[PDB]
Design a protein around this ligand. Structure first.
Ligand SMILES: Nc1ncnc2c1ncn2[C@@H]1O[C@H](COP(=O)(O)OP(=O)(O)O)[C@@H](O)[C@H]1O
Ligand SMILES: Nc1ncnc2c1ncn2[C@@H]1O[C@H](COP(=O)(O)OP(=O)(O)O)[C@@H](O)[C@H]1O
Ligand SMILES: [Mg+2]
Ligand SMILES: [Mg+2]
Lengths: 1717, 257
């Protein structure tokens, strides 16, 4: 619990790493012998004989495998011994496996068999593989082995259509299904935390790396995944491949491998090629004579196989290959023994000479004719392939190479010699023994699986290391844990991920590491007594002491804040950067100590040189002469002396940037290690200083990052970065003293006289414009005198070449202050190749003060290109700041108004039981709203009771006109549904009036406002009916118009709210009887503007500020320094619980979280902290047993468990019923805390005492970026912290990022300024006003604008709308330009007609778009895609391409779903591209007509699509018929009834009736029924038998029969004789129903209710000609009159069509002949 | 011969010590101090601290002064901008081009003289600055003798002391004629100048103007600096004295071993 002891971790570290020998003895196989010789001793081990086939194990043929796995094994006839023993456990079970076999036994195919099983789990009906369904991770030790396995696995599985790739230094990871990486690579990826949730299989190849220093990486990977399986219950299969070493059973426990199922051990006797071992241990310790003894032994061993077998020699440096190959040969001809390798006259000799000529390599040229060769990574790619080809063809006799050949190529040899086992370790700063993995892999290449009946491995080393390599290659080197060394770095990585939040989590996490298993089985080897082992049998105290020690080290270095007593861990931004950038904790401590904004480039290099990754580097005495030569000439001065190793590291870095080659062998290896680490190290320093706002140091470190990558300083010409260039010219361009900027505006050949090469003329001009260059323009938009909104326009001014720029180019947008000292704002900008020519718009906020600073600076710097920057100065000399907002309306100290002040018994019955008196705000406005008819403005904070203020005006209207009609407008649909429920009981249940809610379906919307007394609607819903006000009387007869939450005018959907209220004012001006307008708003800074715009007198303008809220609001704003969103959310988890126990320990709490997934995670986190506090069920105020009546109604299992502890959560994915149960339990006080998602803040019918806003950002899956909360959403969330008759105060804690803290303080403590954006969407409204003839000329458009809010704000804040003055000529030109631009686009799309550049008139297209409320862009694309030959398939395609469907989300976890849905969908589409919402919309449409049950989100996505489909369908009907196209119009008319009933034209008409199953309609398609009228005319006891339904399903079938359309049609041609060409032909059509209707259209699968619409079409069938068409709605009786002009003289036959828009099977057809003289 | 005992010379160029010392110039910005006439000059602290951090402790650097007067009050001169032009200097003087700064931003301001660092604090104004200030007045009539001043930022130990001087009529006609560059020229008198009042302030901010295509420091590229050179200006802040782009020879001479 708390008996901690601080441990010395370094004394628990096995210092030798993989060279640590745990076995004290080593037994040799029978026949092993030793021979003493001069200066050295040899040890021989005979080749082991295979084990005779034990039991029933026969070699399994490949054709006996499962059918689907035989393609990954084509080219193999039979599996070997270990593969046939493993194929059943590999292919037929999901058991975690561990295979231990000697190198070369064929372990890869076993891992391939499990990969094939996982791929088989995603077989498709199509036959391909669902590739976005899973992911496989193949962990390989070496990078060369990774690359070869990518090609091998890519070829073996190419027939499966599967991507196998190695991760680059990230759309590829989603594209690849099998990721091949090193342990360190996958550690860095999962450390960030993406697509790792799809990992189903992990393969840890060469898992005996655990014994190596890199071993702890494998332990961290396994413990992370296994522990993740428990908190996710998504199982992952673990496959481990190992060599033959002890402790394999401990490895099996470490991988969760059942020993009786998944453990398989094969000793070295299962090596397919027998191996004779030879170990040469040299006793000579003097380096010079030991060097020659080594060269004498290799010669003696070479001669034993010279001419008989090929010999492969392994050295440990790219330089030693040539030395060893030459030294061997040179002594051969010194002894005259060259004729043995080559026959001096056979085919082997000549081909070694012809290719030595064309080989190009110089060193290999001197060795290839003699039979010798070299191989190392420093050589070319085709030379190494030739060395591999010539050696595989048995031409090369002696090949000297390094370990890279052993890992990356499958090149076996009969004899393998390991000349020496000493390697230089720059990380350790000394010579060390070779790694165990390299030894096994090199000697594993001894013996070819075909020619050689045996292999001969020879290993030369020092005598003191014979026992080690004898143990390693004879199954006797135990695999131990090197984990205590890297323990502090790994614990921090789990804290940053949130997997470990306290010490007990770490003790549990430590129990999953290989160190824990080895500590239990061998405690004496890990510094543990065998009696301390069971004074703590599970090692609880020992692990807790190890965690305590590591946590203290992290706390001292400021990576973690560690509470020693409670054990809790706190993440920090410093601790996150060390984890994400793979930096040790001691280094980031040094960075935290020395980094300062005033840092020079001199100290910056010194800071880098002190990183703990170079702690072992020393200055050797043989290096000081070469180092001092450079130190006295380095361009960056070095303060430290030569004796200090930090100066050596400093000089080596500067020498690497200048590309200088030194001579010291240790210096070169030290320089590579220092600069290889410089990449992520300097990148870590960059992120530290960038997020702190240090402008000067950020520019220094970002340049140093690029100078290390590009290997050049800033002083050089930036054209060096183009590697494809004959270099010796750019060095002359540098000599030419002229800036690189002068080359842009310059001739393609004036370059040549400047650099002396018209020779290489336009070659320079090519790369000058290939260099990235961006142009910047800015538009300043002042919000206050304290805040500015900057709209930055980025315009690329270069050209894209994928060979140079790749797929994207990254840039850093930096906004610096006056002194280039503080970064006021910064963000990441990625320029994709698909948008390399389009302008980019970036918007952000910056603070300003009122001795207005001279200027700011905007710098757009490239992320990788050196000297690639564009700085735009932002002068404020002409910036026009808006005026200070006027003081608020003072809250009068009036007496509280009683409910009896209404003086109406019926009205008082609405509030008598709710509260005794109105609040002070309702008190002030009472006389003006209840006892007056003037226009009134009420601006008060959210929660001030403004809803009752509007009810005052409604109650007054009912007194005057008892059947008056009021229209209430609220911006959110969730607000309208809530207001409708309250006002239905108040005004309809009690006062017996009519309260309706507009549905958005116009087919039954005009019918409610004429019926109701209070109309509740959203802006857009009212806009469509508002446009036809001059003909429809039910819009201008309105007595009272109320618009609520009018401060949303500055929001995304603000302009629509501006248009209707501006229209109601214009209507009221031309209506004789003025319309009262009541405006409710949040506290507005410019409320007098809203008052003047809506005609509110100043005495009736109530502009209150947030301080006058009835329930006082206690606001707290916490800043959080972490910039990584997921890490910042973690740092706020426990503060959420601590804010609950502080501000509301027992009163209800609401927590707003960004996403749906966070609702569940936070609710569990709050309970876990409540659990560790032993406060379990403290938020549960209801008895456990008194909740199951409500509890077992849910589907979510997690929601049930947390509700049992008083914590609920709400999100958009819950059931509409489940939310009401959680909302009722919260308001009941049963549960105290509920965690709501961000998107539910507008439809939440519960209030609480404390509101916690967890972060103010959300990820948008469309732009792939985090978006700030709209300020309107935050105000709505704070409004939930208000309970007037429960609490004396309201409290809200907002936990935001530190940079956003100043923004909320300025826009929450003060009233909110609101602007308009109607000028950014004028086309659709201008077109509407031209259709109804409100705008007839260009002067009318300017006059029309004078009634808006956009318009009035142009004089108060002109710079916000891009005006430079408020002069009445300044804005007169600004309006005219907006008028000219808007009318020119409408005339371009053929919706309006402009005559003499003055008069405007609507066209047929414009009248259609304004009628059905459709974007003018959609109506133009509609008009250019339909023919006379348009069918149902194309109608679905054209309407799917509508602009109203552009914003349908694209969740790429649905890619294969839509890919397969495309095959299940009846109509096939050409060019299938699934990155388009219009293609997804088309697929969701056909999925609805097919009645296909989809996802919960896909079905919801379809619902929003269908809410606009009817109006789009009706638009094409008006377009097709206007062009005389008969067949497509009728087809579109029956597409409307198809969408309504969710059917197809060929489907059965009985599919409309309820409960009619999928097949029992076919039960009677064989009989004689096929219409609904057939079912209508069938008798009960006769028809209630075939239906197979119950006493309630019969009635649903029945009630559809009564409302099914059954109209008797009658037509008559007036004067059927007195007709000829040019004469009027009129046809009267009479329609009458049988009975009538009680209710709208019965269409359960359509979201909105509809009314029965009908067309009457006259057309010529054989000519596809539509003559006349008229829409209508029928009420019992109706009479329509169709007219047209007769054609030529003759006897033409027409057709009368009577088609519905909501029912299938009611259409009627009547042919008739008209004799035209 | 040769000697029983001999060593090899190691290069120790002097700019490396000055570059290391230039890194600590920001510490002096925490300790700046000031030492009648009729005109009061107000220097904003933001541009002065920046002018210190971009300087050298021995090589003098200079910048041109521009500003205006407060609205309804003309007895005070508010310095609003410092302009850095291509220049190279020594421990006693600086060398500017003959052309004065020309830009639209400065057309609404008046020239108020110049400001320059100097190594040692001296109780009297340099004879070189009298010659420089007077010769600028002879070639540019926009520099009023009763309006333009010389601000000296002398590097005191661990601090910075500011003193502002104007030129008397007596000193102008001697500075324009003087061709003796020594410390005791012939006809140098303390009556050639008087001290003007100078006050630092934090209530407003100034800005910098730097060359358009070039930078300002030519102390390592003196060959390319000519008194007849021309230059345009941009609205940006100047780089440090030893910035990378000010001494290219040091970085590429190391590249060619
Ligand atoms: N079933 C098999 N049948 C015939 N040859 C095989 C078979 N399996 C492997 N070989 C070969 O044996 C060699 C061993 O390769 P590998 O799978 O990497 O062994 P390991 O991983 O255990 O060291 C490969 O070249 C491989 O092509
Ligand atoms: N006069 C009042 N007296 C006591 N409680 C009230 C009063 N008015 C409202 N409450 C309650 O306070 C809450 C305020 O909600 P609301 O009317 O929507 O205010 P607003 O629209 O300004 O945000 C309502 O639940 C309401 O029932
Ligand atoms: Mg292998
Ligand atoms: Mg409200």
């Amino acid at each position: 619990l708390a008996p901690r002891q601080v441990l010395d971790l370094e004394d628990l570290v096995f210092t030798q790493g993989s060279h640590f020998m745990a076995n004290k003895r080593c037994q040799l196989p029978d026949g092993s012998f030793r021979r003493q010789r001069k200066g050295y001793e040899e040890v021989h081990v005979p080749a082991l004989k295979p084990k005779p086939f034990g039991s029933e194990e026969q070699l399994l043929p490949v054709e006996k495998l499962p059918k689907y796995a035989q393609a990954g094994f084509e080219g193999f006839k039979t599996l070997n011994r270990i593969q046939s023993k493993l194929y059943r456990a590999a292919l037929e079970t999901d058991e975690n496996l561990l295979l231990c076999a000697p190198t070369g036994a064929g372990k890869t195919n076993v891992a391939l068999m499990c990969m094939l099983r996982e791929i088989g789990k995603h077989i498709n009906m199509d036959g391909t593989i669902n590739v976005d369904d899973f992911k496989i991770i193949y962990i390989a030790p070496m990078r060369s082995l990774v690359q070869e396995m990518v090609g091998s696995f890519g070829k073996r599985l190419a027939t499966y259509g599967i991507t196998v790739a190695e991760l680059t230094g990230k759309e590829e990871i989603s594209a690849t299904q099998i990721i091949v990486c090193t342990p360190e690579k996958w550690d860095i990826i999962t450390r960030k935390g993406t697509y790792t949730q799809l990992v189903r299989l992990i393969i840890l190849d060469e898992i005996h790396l655990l014994h190596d220093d890199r071993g702890p990486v494998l332990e961290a990977l396994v413990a992370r995944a296994i522990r993740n399986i428990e908190m996710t219950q998504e199982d992952v299969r673990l496959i481990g491949l190992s060599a033959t070493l002890p402790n394999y059973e401990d490895v099996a426990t470490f991988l969760r491998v059942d020993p009786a199922k998944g453990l398989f051990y094969f000793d070295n006797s299962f090596r397919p090629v027998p191996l004779e071992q030879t170990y040469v241990g040299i006793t000579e310790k003097k380096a010079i004579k030991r060097f020659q003894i080594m060269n004498e032994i290799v010669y003696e061993k070479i001669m034993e196989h010279a001419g008989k077998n090929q010999v492969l020699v392994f050295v440990h440096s790219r330089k030693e290959t040539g030395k060893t190959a030459r030294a061997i040969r040179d002594m051969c001809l010194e002894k005259d023994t060259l004729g043995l390798f080559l026959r001096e006259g056979s085919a082997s000799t000549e081909v070694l000479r012809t290719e030595a000529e064309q080989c190009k390599n110089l060193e290999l040229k001197d060795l290839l004719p003699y039979g010798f060769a070299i191989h190392h990574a420093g050589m070319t790619r085709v030379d190494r392939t030739l060395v591999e080809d010539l050696f595989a063809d048995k031409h090369i006799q002696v090949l000297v190479s390094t370990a890279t050949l052993a890992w990356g190529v499958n090149l076996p040899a009969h004899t393998v010699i390991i000349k020496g086992t000493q390697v230089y370790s720059p990380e350790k700063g000394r010579w060390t023994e070779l790694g165990a993995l390299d030894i096994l892999q090199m000697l594993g290449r001894a013996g070819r699986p075909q020619y050689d009946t045996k292999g001969e491995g020879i290993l030369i080393t020092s005598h003191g290391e014979l026992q080690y390599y004898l143990s390693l290659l004879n199954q006797q080197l135990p695999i131990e844990s090197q984990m205590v060394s890297k323990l502090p770095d790994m614990l921090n990585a789990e804290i940053v991920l949130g997997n470990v939040q306290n010490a007990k989590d770490a003790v549990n996490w430590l129990g999953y590491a290989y160190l824990y298993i080895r500590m239990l089985r061998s405690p004496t080897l890990y510094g543990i007594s065998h009696d301390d082992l069971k004074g703590d049998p599970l090692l609880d105290q020992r692990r807790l002491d190890l965690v305590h020690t590591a946590a203290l080290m992290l706390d001292k270095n400021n990576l973690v804040k560690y509470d020693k007593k409670t054990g809790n861990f706190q993440v920090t931004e410093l601790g996150r950067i060390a984890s994400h950038y793979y930096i040790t904790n001691d280094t980031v401590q040094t960075y935290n100590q020395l980094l300062k904004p005033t840092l020079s480039e001199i100290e910056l290099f010194r800071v880098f040189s002190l990183s703990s990754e170079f702690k072992n580097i020393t200055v050797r005495e043989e290096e000081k002469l070469e180092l001092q030569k450079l130190l006295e000439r380095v361009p960056i001065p070095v303060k430290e002396s030569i004796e200090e190793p930090s100066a050596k590291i400093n000089v080596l870095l500067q020498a690497f940037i200048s590309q200088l080659k030194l001579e010291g062998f240790a210096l070169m290896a030290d320089m590579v290690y220092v600069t290889q680490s410089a990449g992520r190290l300097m990148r870590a320093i960059f992120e530290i200083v960038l997020n702190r706002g240090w402008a000067q140091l950020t520019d220094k470190t970002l340049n140093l990052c690029k100078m290390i990558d590009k290997r050049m300083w800033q002083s050089m010409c930036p054209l060096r970065q183009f590697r494809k260039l004959p270099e010796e010219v750019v060095k002359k361009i540098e000599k030419k003293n002229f800036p690189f900027e002068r080359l842009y505006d310059l001739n393609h050949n004036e370059i040549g006289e400047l650099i002396r090469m018209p020779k290489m003329g336009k070659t320079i001009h090519k790369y000058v414009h290939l260099f990235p260059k961006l142009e910047l323009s800015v538009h300043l938009q002042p919000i206050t005198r304290s805040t500015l909104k900057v709209e930055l326009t980025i315009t690329p001014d270069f050209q894209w070449d994928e060979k140079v720029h790749g797929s994207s180019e990254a840039f850093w947008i930096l906004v610096e202050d006056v002194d280039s000292e503080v970064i006021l704002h910064h963000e990441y900008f990625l320029l994709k190749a698909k948008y390399a020519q389009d302008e980019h718009l970036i918007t952000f906020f910056v603070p300003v003060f009122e001795p207005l600073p001279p200027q700011y600076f905007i710098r757009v710097v490239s992320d990788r290109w050196l000297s690639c920057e564009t700085q735009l100065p932002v002068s404020f000399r002409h910036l026009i700041l808006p005026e200070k907002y006027p003081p608020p309306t003072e809250l009068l100290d009036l007496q509280p108004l009683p409910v009896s002040a209404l003086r109406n018994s019926a009205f008082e019955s609405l509030y008598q039981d709710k509260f005794p008196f109105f609040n002070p705000i309702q008190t002030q406005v009472f006389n003006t709203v209840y006892n007056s008819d003037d226009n009134v403005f009420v601006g008060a904070p959210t929660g001030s009771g403004k809803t009752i203020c509007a009810e005052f005006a409604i109650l007054r209207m009912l007194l005057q006109s008892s059947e008056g009609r009021c229209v209430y407008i609220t911006p959110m649909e969730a607000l309208a549904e809530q207001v409708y429920m309250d006002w239905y009981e108040k005004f309809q249940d009690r006062l017996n009036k009519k309260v309706v809610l507009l549905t958005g379906e116009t087919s039954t919307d005009l019918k409610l406002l004429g019926k109701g007394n209070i109309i509740i609607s959203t802006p857009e819903k009212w806009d469509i009916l508002s446009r036809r006000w001059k003909q429809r009387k039910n819009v201008q007869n309105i007595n009272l118009f109320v618009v609520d939450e009018v401060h949303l005018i500055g929001g995304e959907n603000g302009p629509v709210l501006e248009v209707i209220c501006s229209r109601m004012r214009y209507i009221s001006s031309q209506i004789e009887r003025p319309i009262r307008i009541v405006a409710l708003s949040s506290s507005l800074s410019n409320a007098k503007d809203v008052a003047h715009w809506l005609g509110c007198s100043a005495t009736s303008t109530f502009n209150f500020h947030p301080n006058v809220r009835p329930v006082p609001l206690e606001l707290h704003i916490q800043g959080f320094n972490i910039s990584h969103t997921q890490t910042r959310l973690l740092s706020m988890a426990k503060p959420v619980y601590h804010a609950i126990t502080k501000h509301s320990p027992k009163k209800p709490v609401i927590v707003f979280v960004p996403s749906r997934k966070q609702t569940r995670l936070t609710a569990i986190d709050i309970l876990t902290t409540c659990a560790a506090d032993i406060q379990r069920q403290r938020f549960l105020h209801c008895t456990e047993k008194d909740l199951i009546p409500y509890l077992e109604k849910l589907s979510d299992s997690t929601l049930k468990e947390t509700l049992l502890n008083g914590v609920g959560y709400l999100h958009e994915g819950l059931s509409p019923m489940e939310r009401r149960l959680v909302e009722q339990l919260f308001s009941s006080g049963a549960i105290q805390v509920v965690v709501a998602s961000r998107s539910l803040c507008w439809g939440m019918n519960v209030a609480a005492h404390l509101v916690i806003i967890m972060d103010t950002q959300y990820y948008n899956g469309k732009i792939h970026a985090y978006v700030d909360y709209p300020i309107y959403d935050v105000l709505q969330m704070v409004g939930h912290a208000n309970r007037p008759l429960q609490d004396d105060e309201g409290r809200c804690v907002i936990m935001c990022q530190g940079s956003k803290k100043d923004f909320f303080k300025k826009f929450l403590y003060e009233p909110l300024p609101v602007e308009s954006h109607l000028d950014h969407c004028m086309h659709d409204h201008f077109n509407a006003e031209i259709v109804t003839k409100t705008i007839e000329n260009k002067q009318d458009a300017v006059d029309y604008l004078t009634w808006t809010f956009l318009y009035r704000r142009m004089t108060q804040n002109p710079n916000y709308y891009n005006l430079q003055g408020i002069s009445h000529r300044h804005l007169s030109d600004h309006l005219s330009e907006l008028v000219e631009q808007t009318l020119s686009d409408l005339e371009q799309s053929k919706c309006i007609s402009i005559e003499d550049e003055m008069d405007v008139a609507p066209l047929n297209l414009g009248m259609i778009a304004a009628y059905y409320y459709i974007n003018y862009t959609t109506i133009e694309l509609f008009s250019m895609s339909l023919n006379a030959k348009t069918k149902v398939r194309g109608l679905i395609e054209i309407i799917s391409n509508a602009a109203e469907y552009e914003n349908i989300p694209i969740r790429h976890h649905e890619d294969n779903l839509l890919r397969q849905l495309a095959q299940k969908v009846p109509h096939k589409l050409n060019n299938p591209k699934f990155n388009d919402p219009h293609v997804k919309t088309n697929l969701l449409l056909q999925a609805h007509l097919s009645r296909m049950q989809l996802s919960a989100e896909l079905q919801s996505d379809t619902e929003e699509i269908l809410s606009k489909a009817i109006r789009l369908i009706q638009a094409c009907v008006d377009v097709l018929s206007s062009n005389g196209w008969l067949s497509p119009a009728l087809a579109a008319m029956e597409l409307a009834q198809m969408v309504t009933q969710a059917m197809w034209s060929k489907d059965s008409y009985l599919k409309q009736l309820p409960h009619f199953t999928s097949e029992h309609i076919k039960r009677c398609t064989d009989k004689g029924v096929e219409s609904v009228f057939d079912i209508m005319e069938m008798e009960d006891e006769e028809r209630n038998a075939l239906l197979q339904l119950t006493d309630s399903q019969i009635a649903d079938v029945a009630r559809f029969c009564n409302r099914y359309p059954n109209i008797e049609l009658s037509y008559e041609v007036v004067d059927k004789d007195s007709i000829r060409s040019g004469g009027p032909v009129v046809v009267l059509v009479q329609l009458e129903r049988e009975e009538e209707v009680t209710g709208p259209v019965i269409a359960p699968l359509f979201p909105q209710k509809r009314e029965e619409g009908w067309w009457v079409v006259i057309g010529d069938a054989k000519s596809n000609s539509l003559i006349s068409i008229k829409r209508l709605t029928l009420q019992q009786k109706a009479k329509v009159k169709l007219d047209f002009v007769a054609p030529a003289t003759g006897a033409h036959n027409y057709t009368l069509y009577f088609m519905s828009d909501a029912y299938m099977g009611c259409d009627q057809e009547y042919k008739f002949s008209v004799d035209v003289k | 011969p040769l000697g029983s005992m001999t060593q090899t010379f190691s290069s120790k160029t002097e700019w490396r010590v000055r570059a290391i010392s230039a890194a600590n110039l920001h510490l002096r910005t925490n300790h700046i101090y000031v030492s009648e006439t009729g005109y009061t000059y107000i220097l904003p602290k933001n541009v002065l601290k920046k002018f210190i951090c971009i300087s050298d402790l021995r090589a003098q650097i200079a910048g041109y002064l521009y500003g205006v007067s407060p609205p309804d009050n003309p007895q005070v001169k508010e310095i609003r901008c410092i302009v850095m032009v291509p220049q190279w200097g020594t421990h006693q003087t600086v060398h500017l081009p003959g052309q004065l700064p020309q830009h639209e931003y400065l057309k609404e301001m008046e020239p108020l003289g110049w400001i320059h660092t100097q190594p040692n604090e001296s109780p009297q104004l340099s004879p070189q600055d009298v010659t420089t200030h007077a010769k600028i007045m002879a070639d540019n009539p926009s520099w009023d003798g009763e309006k333009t001043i010389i601000i000296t930022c002398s590097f005191t130990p661990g601090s910075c002391t500011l003193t502002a001087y104007k030129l008397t009529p007596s000193g102008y006609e001697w500075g324009r004629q003087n061709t003796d560059k020594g410390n005791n020229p012939k006809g140098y008198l303390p009556s050639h100048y008087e001290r003007v009042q100078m006050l630092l302030s934090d209530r407003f901010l100034g800005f910098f103007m730097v060359p358009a295509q070039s930078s300002w420091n030519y102390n390592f590229m003196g060959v390319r600096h000519d008194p007849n050179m021309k230059y345009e200006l941009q609205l940006a802040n100047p780089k440090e004295f030893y910035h990378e782009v000010h001494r290219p020879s040091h970085f590429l001479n190391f590249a060619l071993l």
